[PDB]
Symmetry: C4
Subunit: 445 residues, 4 copies
């Protein structure tokens, strides 16, 4: 049914070893996309101590480049995995090969060996295409797990603001170095003074102090607090902050809208907790007794912990798996009454449709004597009494009266924890109207 | 049905005296969780005047520790209260015993008697586990009262912001004391100047001025106003404010989303106030008369003050309590017509299903002469006329015409306040089709 | 039906002259609730030029006090207007008499004539109970007009922010005057300097400059901009601004939530504009022709301008007014076919139920030849052709084929603007199954 | 059907050349509405180099004025295009002629030639009525394209904030020039100092520096950041900023509400992605097997990519176009079974109602042996097996058993990609109950 593995060169994408390589390269992509604006903004050429780290950081991405010619992929309009080499290679060469290949050049060595022209350093910015691995990690997370999709959209949106503030801090520091050191007093950092400390001659301050000051400015700006102890003084800095606040206005509105859309679509538990209020306000706008309505409030409080299970599989998709699990679950404790002592298997797998499951309290009254019967009760386990018999597990009652349209002679009550099954004789009568092999064996008592 | 109180050592959790102890310890937990950051941040060791208060404040929590081995608790998967001592003790020793016990040590005396090492004072922060009583108070409030659940979620969220601003103010003051007094001018408070007052030599300013300044900074920061007369100058202070504003951005978005989700799920009164607009715009997009549509607008305005009571108990839960209250309410003013002079009790408790309650105005017209009858009217009290008889309380009409399919001879009108009951003869005919002991006695006139 | 006007002292509340007095006193209540914080905050005793205005401003409220013993009011649980004098007077004396009476005392003369004690001036603040007229004006506006209720709730909430900023500005100015003039440099205004202008000796600056500065501070604070050129320097001013920003945080969240809840509950026009997109995307996800689907898109675009009128009066309230207007509208252009040449009036007022109104385009095809008929068309006006006759106004067709279950012989098309009525013969057949006096006269052709 | 083009002077509004003129004038309207506040605010009379541009800019609007007497327009209450000259001219002369005509006067030459009175320059502000073309462009965009209406409302609202900040910057600069140059130190720009640069003698600073400073202030104010390095010092400037922040508070609340209302009305894909979670949590709250429920989860994942197509054309509008495309699509691969070898065309175009389209996986089981048949399967293409025959394209099965109420003898399974059609024999039986010409030819095998 595969039609392939006649090649034995191609890697199945859901292999165990290949999924270990994919999480190795994601950490390198996270590190490489955080270091690149710091390399562009705070240096003009790397020092000697970062040479071997800069060389090692590209070998992993070159190995990842050569691996993509050996991976099978799943087609979109069809749903078969392609195992053919030329179809793999042409899809790679038309999608992602070019930027991945030219982001692996040694751009720090080319800058130092060609007379230190500043426009050569602008090609470092194409290494920010490596966040593709992070967006593919977030795309794979939201489909196949047990967490809802809106929470992952909030976490995905929260990851974007960290990256945007870090990049804005690096660019805001870089703009101050495009003036000569003799015009230092006309920049945002060369004229800064905080406490009794002066930021003059700022190119010789160590790296983490400058980075912390720039990140402090960017994070205070992004939250719209804006103290004003650090601000812009140039025209280029004014243009940069005018672009930056316009972007994060829309970003903050998107975050607020996503959190609101999460909260508005609340859960079903509070979709019946309000119904509690409507019912008891109806019961108390006029006057009424207190005892058996407190009984029915405890009843619905334990009943709504099971009644969400009804609507999800009433008839939403027409599966025969519900017939399989219905033969699996209910009637292996219902064959044991003499009611179904000799019914055909047609009626055993036909009965299962309207056995609704509800749980009850040790203080309710089960059935009435002066009654026309409505529901038939089918017990899982029980120690429940009646005042003439005490009904136990794997039993039933009520069918002594309903088909012959008689009142029940029993006053059935409870002292224990309940698991019984509903039955209306609407479905019993209409399919007993078709098949009566059972109906002979039901009235054979 | 209890199976216990054979021990007589165990306290029922819904006792009257025990609920007085629970509100005594909640005030101590509120006080103890507000004083602990002020003790950590503004002192290095307590003075002499707080000694007896510090000793007394732990005795109540030790007594509360020894009381938890004597309280019965309600099981989760079962719903019976456990009264056994070893099952109580093992649940306490696996849940909450450790942090409650080690938060009761005298950590101020241990700090002074071991050479004043600063790391010993960090163990004061485990006394913030005593806000468990406040979150359990807010969990008990939202289930069993007459207030809706979203308003309590807004009040619960508003309590968190007070506690967060108070703790942030204490930590922001504490960070300034981790420098020596000779580097005082490189702190946020040691370099502050407001008006013509200087904050130098700040360790000798009295306590409430320092606390008020720090709380003013924290509350102005939390609302995102940010005047900038107080700000950070260090690197540790910059890192602290970078963490703090990122937290309250998400907190403010959560508050806005909760208030919006409260407002969007509006009440039913304005769910028919718009329906007023749709109906009268339909009536006025074409031309129509004015008199009897003003009648029906006053009619629906007094009718929608009762028609919310229909849907809540049509058939939502299948209770026989509605049959009990239906025998209790309606027909003790409906037996008094000669219509039901001799009907069986089966028909008396069967009739009750489709008597819908509506109230009317002193100016409407009740019934028509040239008619096929649709509704049957069953009056609570009345002084209403017809032009040949004036119908009063405990009466009926319309049944002279409907079962024999005749037109009504009466022109029934009103001058008084109305309480009558609807009836369609759909239900009357289909259950009169089953039982006619009544039907003999109805036509016995 | 009134039972009263046997008194002739009492004023009906919906009189014409009394509604002129109610709008006279509303302007005085607006003026009196804006002037009172300016009188408290910017003066210590009024000057001579405001004496006659201060005296005149209380006479109107005294006259309004004596008028409330002569107004009839509508009861709540009943809905009759009460005309009895003692029932009027006791309701006034238990609701609103006390604060209205003691807000009319001459508190400026009492302050000057009792030694100028400052605590006497605090009784001016009970004149802010006169905003009751504004909240009653906003309560009367939202019930009985043609504007929706959420827009009036937004305008009501926008009125509150103006009043809150004006009162906060007056209190913020008042706090600076509670220090002596020798400690002037320790206040927010006594130490202010803007441009090359100094605010020293601030008690002799004229009134509108001081008021404009305080209102500028309050409005910049309320919008959370916070420039920081004006700020607090005292402890009492810090406590005041800490209270003030906490209030308007919740106020701004309430405003955002109300505007969002207005926008989310959009109109029905865009509730079918999306349905346009779903239908044409279904029609274009597979391939299809272009001509007659462009016809049906123009059809539904002119059809949804009338199909909102269906659901509002299908069966929502069971009125006979729809039978009255149904005899008024449709069939006075439908009696003119020989189809209903002699039907009984029972069938004339019975037919009206399923004549749905739709409008059409000059390019559609009306009917088919090779057909089993589904709908019957009942024209208002027309010049529509068929290829053998050209059907005009007050006519019909299709009934030549449907009751005898024949195909139609006509190919009916259009060139003009359409107003015809639907009819399914489901309703025609089931009520023709009951009454056939008509059925003789229908087949009398 | 037109009734016109007997004039040959009038231009049809959907001509090809006229739609080229409409986009030419939109660029001139955008330029003219951006230049006018810069001409009012930063100059007192234009210089010599802008003379020919100022003259040329009005000739296009004069030509556009004379063109509007020759355009046909579509009536509102009718839907016919009017081609009559006097009806065109009177609508123009009552709607838009006056402001368009008097905005074309040479107001720069009139100011210089009448003694330079400043009130003459205020008539430049009536050229801001030319944004009518931009609001008509945004009105035409949102009706007839493939983008949803709420996204265009967000983009329309984002365009307003750019125009409002640009106009506010020009007015804020203009207010500083209304004082003499000797009171320069009492303005916002004449007292400004940034870094080591001073803004004194500000009328001789070049234009783009002044404009960039004013726009930086306005954009920082609009986002509610508010650094405070530029602020107001006068009373007129205070009044202007008090008006401006009150406007953009409501504007920001409107933007947040629109984005939230976009996000809350999410798409249908995540309206079944939650249903995945509810179904598998129902299947895993009790214990169950893993194999065939993983089958049905892959089934519903490929099934919900087609089941949105059902509800949109079940019965929403009653079109015969669905009968036309139903004869076009399905049964030209269903005539090829001997099941419909000789049925009448009535049954061929009657069958089409309940053939629902679903797609399946290469691993499912199609049918059962021990069965009462529910659905009938009608294949597009297939290579599917049974264990006795391998069923291919243009075939069917299941009808060997269902009409005679027999069990199926086949165990039908799959290995390929599925396109089969559902059929319940409810519709087959009820319309086979009417027409049995087919029923003879179905049982003719
Ligand atoms: K802000
Ligand atoms: K600020
Ligand atoms: K701010
Ligand atoms: K500021």
């Amino acid at each position: 049914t595969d039609g392939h593995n006649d090649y034995k060169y191609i890697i199945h994408p859901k292999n165990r070893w290949y999924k270990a390589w994919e999480m190795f390269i994601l950490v390198w992509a996270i590190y490489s996309s955080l270091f690149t604006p710091m390399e562009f903004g705070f240096f003009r050429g790397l020092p000697e101590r970062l040479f071997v780290l800069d060389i090692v950081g590209q070998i992993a991405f070159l190995v990842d480049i050569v691996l993509q010619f050996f991976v099978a992929y799943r087609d979109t309009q069809t749903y078969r995995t392609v195992y053919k080499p030329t179809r793999i290679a042409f899809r790679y060469l038309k999608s992602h090969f070019l930027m991945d290949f030219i982001g692996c050049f040694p751009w720090d060595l080319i800058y130092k060996a060609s007379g230190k022209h500043e426009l050569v350093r602008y090609l470092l910015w194409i290494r920010l295409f490596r966040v593709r691995k992070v967006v593919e990690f977030f795309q794979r997370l939201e489909k196949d797990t047990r967490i809802n999709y809106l929470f992952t959209r909030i976490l995905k949106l929260l990851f974007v603001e960290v990256y945007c503030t870090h990049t804005a801090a690096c660019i805001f520091y870089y703009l101050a170095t495009t003036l000569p050191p003799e015009n230092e007093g006309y920049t945002w950092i060369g004229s800064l003074k905080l406490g009794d400390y002066s930021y003059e001659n700022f190119r010789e301050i160590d790296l983490w102090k400058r980075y912390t000051t720039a990140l402090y400015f960017a994070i205070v700006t992004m939250a719209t607090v804006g103290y004003g102890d650090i601000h812009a003084v140039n025209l280029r800095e004014m243009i940069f902050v005018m672009i930056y606040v316009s972007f994060d206005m829309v970003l903050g509105a998107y975050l607020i809208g996503n959190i609101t859309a999460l909260i508005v679509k609340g859960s079903n538990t509070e979709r019946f907790r309000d119904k509690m209020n409507d019912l008891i306000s109806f019961m108390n706008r006029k006057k009424l007794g207190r005892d058996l309505r407190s009984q029915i409030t405890g009843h619905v409080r334990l009943q709504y912990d099971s009644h969400y299970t009804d609507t999800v599989m009433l008839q939403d998709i027409p599966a025969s798996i519900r017939a399989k699990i219905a033969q699996l679950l209910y009637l292996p404790y219902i064959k044991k009454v003499p009611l179904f002592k000799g019914c055909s298997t047609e009626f055993i797998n036909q009965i299962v449709i309207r056995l609704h499951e509800e749980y009850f309290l040790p203080g309710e009254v089960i059935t009435e004597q002066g009654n026309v019967v409505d529901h038939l009760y089918f017990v899982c386990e029980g120690l429940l009494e009646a005042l003439v018999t005490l009904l136990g597990p794997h039993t039933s009652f009520g069918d002594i009266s309903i088909i012959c349209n008689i009142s029940q002679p029993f006053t059935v009550r409870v002292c224990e924890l309940c698991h019984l099954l509903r039955l209306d004789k609407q479905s019993f009568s209409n399919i007993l109207e078709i098949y009566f092999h059972d109906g002979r064996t039901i009235l054979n008592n």
